[PDB]
Amino acid sequence: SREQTMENILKAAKKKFGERGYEGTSIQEIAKEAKVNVAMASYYFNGKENLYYEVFKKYGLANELPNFLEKNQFNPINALREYLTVFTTHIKENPEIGTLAYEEIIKESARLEKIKPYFIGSFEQLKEILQEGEKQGVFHFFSINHTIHWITSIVLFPKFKKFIDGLVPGDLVSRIISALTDK
């Protein structure tokens, strides 16, 4: 019942913050969405700023990711496919993470710093998988920086990709992999 209520409030926080952003969302709005009074929301989460962080802590990218390269016997295509599947599926089921993150990147706020780990943590692996695929002659790209840039844009901002798709004539993961294995 404690956990249920805490979960209810975090689900509501994610929903409302995702709709209106940090500033446009109130603790009252959230509490109302969660069917609890404001005092109940303060008790568990102690104010707007910390609730926002707990939203990223709970629904952000899971911090305990296996090593995808080892998990996939150092087959980089297989490692990248699994990595990207894990990560794009997460953003599909928790889209607010993507849209809130990619927002705060523009406001360059103090929130950004505390938020980073919960959508950024796995980029190190993404670098390793790519560099090992390049080393194996299985991936081809101009630079690692350029490639992480467009791959993480798709991961965090899949709707921009849909938007460009509407203007210029799939499966996201397969499309990332085809762009990399083009020789």
Residues in contact with its own copies by the rule CB under 8 A: 20-21, 23-24, 99, 102-103, 105-106, 108, 120, 123, 127, 142-146, 148-150, 152-154, 157, 159-161, 163-165, 167-169, 175, 178-179, 182
Least gap, CB of 155 to its own copies (angstroms): 12
Least gap, CB of 21 to its own copies (angstroms): 7
The two structure tokens encoding residue 73: 């016997």
Q: Which of 105, 91, 111 is nearest to 23 (CA)?
A: 111
Q: Which is nearer to its own copies, 35 or 107 (CB)?
A: 107
How far apart CA 92 and CA 145 sit, in angstroms, is 25
Q: Which is nearer to its own copies, 2 or 183 (CB)?
A: 183
- The DSSP call for residue 138 is S
Least gap, CB of 143 to its own copies (angstroms): 7
Q: Which is nearer to its own copies, 14 or 36 (CB)?
A: 14
Q: Which is nearer to its own copies, 35 or 175 (CB)?
A: 175
Least gap, CB of 163 to its own copies (angstroms): 5
The amino acid occupying position 161 is: K
Q: Which residues of 73-109 are buried (b: 16+ CB within 10 A; e: fewer)?
A: eebbbebbbbbbeebbebbeebebbbbbbbbbeeeee
Burial of 44 (0-12, 13-18, 19+ CB in 10 A): middle
Distance of CA 129 to the CA centre of its chain: 18
Least gap, CB of 24 to its own copies (angstroms): 4
Q: Which is nearer to its own copies, 51 or 176 (CB)?
A: 176
